[PDB]
mmCIF file of N, CA and C and ligand atoms in Angstrom:
data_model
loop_
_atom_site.group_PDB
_atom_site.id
_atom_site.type_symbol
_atom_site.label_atom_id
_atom_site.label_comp_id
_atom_site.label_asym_id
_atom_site.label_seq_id
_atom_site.Cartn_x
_atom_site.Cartn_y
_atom_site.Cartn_z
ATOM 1 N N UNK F 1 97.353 149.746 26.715
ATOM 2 C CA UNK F 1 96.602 148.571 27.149
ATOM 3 C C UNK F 1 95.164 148.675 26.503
ATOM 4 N N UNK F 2 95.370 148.737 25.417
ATOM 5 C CA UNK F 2 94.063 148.702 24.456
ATOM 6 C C UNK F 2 92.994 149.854 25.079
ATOM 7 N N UNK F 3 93.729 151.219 25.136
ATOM 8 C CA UNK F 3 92.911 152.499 25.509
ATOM 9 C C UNK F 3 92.282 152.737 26.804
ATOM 10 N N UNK F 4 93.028 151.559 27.938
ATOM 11 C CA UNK F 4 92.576 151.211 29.133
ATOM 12 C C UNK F 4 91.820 150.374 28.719
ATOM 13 N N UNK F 5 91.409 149.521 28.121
ATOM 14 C CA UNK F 5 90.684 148.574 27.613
ATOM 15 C C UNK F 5 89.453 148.548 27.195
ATOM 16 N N UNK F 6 89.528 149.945 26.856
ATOM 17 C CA UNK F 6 88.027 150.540 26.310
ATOM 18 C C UNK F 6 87.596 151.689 26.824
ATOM 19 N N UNK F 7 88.358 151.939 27.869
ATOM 20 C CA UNK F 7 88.332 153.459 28.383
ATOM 21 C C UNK F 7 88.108 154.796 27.283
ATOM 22 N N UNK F 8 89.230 154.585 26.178
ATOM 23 C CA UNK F 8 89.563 155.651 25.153
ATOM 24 C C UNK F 8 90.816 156.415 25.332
ATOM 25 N N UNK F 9 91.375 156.342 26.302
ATOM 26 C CA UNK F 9 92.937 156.558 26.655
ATOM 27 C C UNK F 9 93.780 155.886 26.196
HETATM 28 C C1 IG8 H 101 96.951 151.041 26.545
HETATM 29 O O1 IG8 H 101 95.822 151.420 26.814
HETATM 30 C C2 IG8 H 101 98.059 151.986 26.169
HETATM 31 C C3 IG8 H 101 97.764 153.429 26.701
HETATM 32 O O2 IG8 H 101 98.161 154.269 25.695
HETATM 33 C C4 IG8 H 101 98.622 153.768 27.952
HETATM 34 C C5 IG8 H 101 97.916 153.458 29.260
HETATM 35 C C6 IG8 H 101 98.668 154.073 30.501
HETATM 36 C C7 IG8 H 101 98.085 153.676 31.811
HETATM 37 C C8 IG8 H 101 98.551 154.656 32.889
HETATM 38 C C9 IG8 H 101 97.417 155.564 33.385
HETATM 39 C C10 IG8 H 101 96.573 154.843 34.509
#
């Protein structure tokens, strides 16, 4: 989901 959504995950 897009890296948590900006998370980086
Ligand atoms: C989107 O961000 C794809 C990621 O690789 C997987 C996210 C997994 C979410 C489950 C952990 C809360």
């Amino acid at each position: 989901l897009x890296x948590x959504l900006x998370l980086x995950i």
